[PDB]
Curated annotation (Swiss-Prot):
Transfers electrons from cytochrome c551 to cytochrome oxidase. One of its GO terms (cellular component) is plasma membrane. It comes from Pseudomonas aeruginosa (strain ATCC 15692 / DSM 22644 / CIP 104116 / JCM 14847 / LMG 12228 / 1C / PRS 101 / PAO1). It comes from the Bacteria. Pfam families: Copper-bind. This is Azurin. InterPro entries: Azurin, BlueCu_1, BlueCu_1_BS, Cu-binding_ET, Cupredoxin. The gene is azu.
Length: 125
């Protein structure tokens, strides 16, 4: 009921496909940042939304800027998210699996780097 995820100095997560076991009550993502670049150069977060909401979350987050960790304040579309981290930092987020529904498609992504491909799927199993 947990996954360790890395975002590196080249806008890449170490996985592009997460599976959440339907028997989990909560799910935890442990985000870390191998490499050497700080968060005001190559910072990463881990953000979860439906596939349909991803674009809006990204656009509005980029617009909100570094001072808001690249997320729109109180964004109702964001199911769960970590803070923005630089190399050597770490952050975890836990959310209730009840927030995910059968038949929906979910995406995870780093909001400042989603346009550069830093995204992947999240699926119940
Ligand atoms: Cu990033």
């Amino acid at each position: 009921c947990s996954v360790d995820i890395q975002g590196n100095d080249q806008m890449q997560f170490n996985t592009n496909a997460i599976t959440v076991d339907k028997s989990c009550k909560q799910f935890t993502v442990n985000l870390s940042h191998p490499g050497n670049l700080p968060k005001n150069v190559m910072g990463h977060n881990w953000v979860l939304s439906t596939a349909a909401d991803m674009q809006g979350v990204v656009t509005d987050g980029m617009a909100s800027g570094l001072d808001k960790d690249y997320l729109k304040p109180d964004d109702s579309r964001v199911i769960a998210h970590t803070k923005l981290i630089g190399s050597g930092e770490k952050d975890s987020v836990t959310f209730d699996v009840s927030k995910l529904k059968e038949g929906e498609q979910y995406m995870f992504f780093c909001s400042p780097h989603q346009g550069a491909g830093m995204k992947g799927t999240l699926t119940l199993k």
